[PDB]
Design a protein around this ligand. Structure first.
Ligand SMILES: Nc1nc2c(ncn2[C@@H]2O[C@H](COP(=O)(O)OP(=O)(O)O)[C@@H](O)[C@H]2O)c(=O)[nH]1
Lengths: 428, 48
């Protein structure tokens, strides 16, 4: 019951999907062999949200790995937890994507799509009562942005009732891995507005600060950031997988969050995060968590919520704790700092809790908040786009794939009406 | 095979018997048809 199915589109999607399944597999105590070697019966209770039984008591993930450039699907096949996926759920292409949204969305996408949809339905029927899909994108490249949204605009017509997430990694304002990056963003945003119910936005920058300020890490590797992303993705479905004195399915978390079908760009933050030095000075209490999560540092997206105004928010706690303390705390926030919250929403938080913490901790928490400072992101990408698009820089690459120029203006204006919805709704 | 005997006799050499002649500066036959389109004219301004 409440079955999910997990997509992993692109190099990033195929590299952070490694970490996500290395977190869950540990949480349900299954060896890299796949066999279950946990302790309690609480693991085997709701394992079917993410896995499928196989002979001899072995659970394989219901994941879907799509990516061009098979040079990554040897890495996942050689990683420690790589021998658990089905060999069928590996849809690759011997051709590269070239960091080009067009060919990822027009030519090379278009032949892989059906070869992926043949897979997704082979595990959209394996479900008893499907909860919904979830994806891990990277809005810079061509595989995650071209084939990513193209896969979505197909999932939406065959399963519109269900609920699809988006853990989209967005481009960075100061860090620029590639040069064409603005184009692959806007043309992809124009797809998320119409075919996504929820979409958290993550940037490598806030991922770098939290890795340098809070975690005080000396060498933040990419395998370390994804330990943060994989920490929050597992933090959503704690209610789906474990009992809790106030459980919250994934659907009831969306309705309490997006007032209108378009403002589905969220902002996340995990707690607690502490160096191996301050583990000596810290106390494991609830006021410690709620102070750290409401901070403007855990915001894994590099937007400052003190510039906007929270429409709604959330909190998903884990660990046997007092259900009043978590309510009076969130009650104080709206009352002390009562300017960063809208007026036409009287109570704009939701609070859940689960009896089962992470494997190695005793208490944790997790944050989601739909702010209006998120428009600062869509402003930044809309300055660099209209800068180089004005002179048709790097345009012959996109139009060679059959694209045209209106495909840019539409995608641009569709960001302008969007960046004002967040503004008119933000009455200071 | 050579020439018959007595036919390799020396001949008279005029002035400028062996002198190349510039045909003319003239438009060539084929411009070879460039494949790549030109650079835009810095004033298209398609963004709106
Ligand atoms: N958190 C995280 N981000 C990554 C990782 N690898 C790539 N990214 C980002 O992914 C962006 C480009 O997308 P990429 O997945 O590498 O190529 P694509 O397959 O064409 O989408 C770049 O901006 C990278 O910084 C990773 O391992 N972890």
């Amino acid at each position: 019951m409440r079955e999910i199915v997990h997509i992993q589109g692109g190099q990033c999607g195929n590299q952070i999907g490694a970490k996500f399944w290395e977190v869950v597999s540990d949480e349900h105590g299954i060896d890299p062999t796949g066999t279950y070697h946990g302790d309690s019966d609480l693991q085997l209770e709701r394992i079917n949200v993410y896995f499928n039984e196989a002979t001899g008591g072995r659970y394989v993930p219901r994941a879907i790995l799509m990516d061009l450039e098979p040079g990554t699907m040897d890495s996942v096949r050689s990683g420690p937890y790589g021998q658990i996926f089905r060999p069928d759920n590996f849809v690759f292409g011997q051709t590269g994507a070239g960091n080009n949204w067009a060919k990822g969305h027009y030519t090379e996408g278009a032949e892989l799509i059906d070869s992926v949809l043949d897979v997704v339905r082979k595990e959209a029927e394996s479900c008893d009562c499907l909860q919904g899909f979830q994806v891990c994108h990277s809005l810079g490249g061509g595989t995650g942005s071209g084939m990513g949204t193209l896969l979505i605009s197909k999932i939406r017509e065959e399963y519109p009732d269900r609920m699809m997430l988006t853990f989209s990694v967005v481009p960075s304002p100061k860090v620029s891995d590639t040069v064409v990056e603005p184009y692959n963003a806007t043309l992809s945003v124009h797809q998320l507005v119409e075919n996504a119910d929820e979409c958290m936005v993550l940037d490598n920058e806030a991922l770098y600060d939290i890795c340098f300020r809070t975690l005080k890490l000396t060498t933040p590797t990419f395998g370390d950031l994804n330990h943060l992303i994989s920490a929050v993705m597992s933090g959503i479905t704690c209610c789906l997988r474990f009992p809790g004195q106030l459980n919250a399915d994934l659907r009831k978390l969306a309705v309490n969050l997006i007032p209108f079908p378009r403002l589905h760009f969220f902002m996340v933050g995990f707690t607690p995060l502490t160096s191996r030095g301050s583990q000596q000075y810290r106390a494991l209490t609830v006021p410690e968590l709620t102070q750290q999560m409401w901070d403007a540092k855990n915001m894994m997206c590099a937007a400052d919520p003190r510039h906007g105004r929270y429409l709604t928010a959330s909190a998903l706690f884990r660990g046997r704790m007092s259900t009043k303390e978590v309510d009076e705390q969130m009650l104080n926030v709206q009352n002390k700092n009562s300017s960063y919250f809208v007026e036409w929403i009287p109570n704009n938080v939701k609070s859940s809790v689960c009896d089962i913490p992470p494997k190695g901790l005793k208490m944790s928490a997790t944050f989601i908040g739909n702010s209006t400072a998120i428009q600062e992101m869509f402003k930044r990408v809309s300055e660099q786009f209209t800068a180089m698009f004005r002179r048709k820089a790097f345009l012959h690459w996109y139009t060679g794939e059959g694209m045209d120029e209106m495909e840019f203006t539409e995608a641009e204006s569709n960001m302008n009406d969007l960046v004002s919805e967040y503004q008119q709704y933000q009455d200071a | 095979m050579g020439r018959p005997d007595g036919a390799n006799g020396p001949a008279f050499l005029h002035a400028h018997e062996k002198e190349p002649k510039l045909p003319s500066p003239g438009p060539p036959s084929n411009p070879k048809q460039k494949i790549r389109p030109p650079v835009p004219a810095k004033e298209e301004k398609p963004t709106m």
